[PDB]
Design a binder for this molecule. Structure first.
Ligand SMILES: COc1ccc(CCc2nc3cc(-c4c(C)noc4C)ccc3n2C[C@H](C)N2CCOCC2)cc1Cl
Length: 118
């Protein structure tokens, strides 16, 4: 599929929005530094690169993920969200457990979208 015309941006953005779960206490909804702006110095030392679901839904509408055949770019942004949460909060916290659960749920929804759309 060398000439894949890309996934519909609105469709990808609705997929990203559906990854924001109440069972995850919405911890991935918005930038950590929008919620905790004074954490910036401490958080950036550990996590130089950040992402969140509101930023990803915005990037989806700009077409940031549309041209990856298997939405590899979106999967990398989900992995970053999850990884930063494990790294900043520690592997024994309930946050790290929520990050691992969210990641597994998100990759399954991404794969089901790819399979459905194609
Ligand atoms: C895993 O168990 C929980 C998870 C989260 C909480 C506390 C809430 C929380 N604890 C949070 C921790 C983070 C966070 C931090 C700090 N570093 O990475 C992440 C991700 C980010 C958001 C967090 N949020 C949600 C923030 C307060 N909200 C803003 C308003 O809209 C709803 C969401 C409590 C529990 Cl019991």
């Amino acid at each position: 599929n060398l000439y894949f015309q890309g996934y519909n941006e609105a469709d990808v953005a609705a997929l990203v929005r559906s990854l924001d779960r109440a069972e995850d206490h919405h911890i991935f909804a918005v930038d950590v530094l929008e919620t905790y702006p004074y954490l910036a110095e401490s958080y950036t030392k550990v996590c130089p690169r950040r992402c969140d679901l509101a930023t990803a839904a915005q990037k989806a509408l700009e077409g940031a993920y549309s041209y990856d055949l298997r939405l590899e770019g979106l999967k990398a942004d989900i992995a970053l969200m999850a990884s930063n949460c494990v790294a900043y909060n520690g592997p024994t916290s309930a946050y790290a457990e929520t990050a691992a659960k969210f990641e597994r749920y998100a990759l399954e929804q991404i794969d089901a979208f790819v399979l459905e759309h194609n």
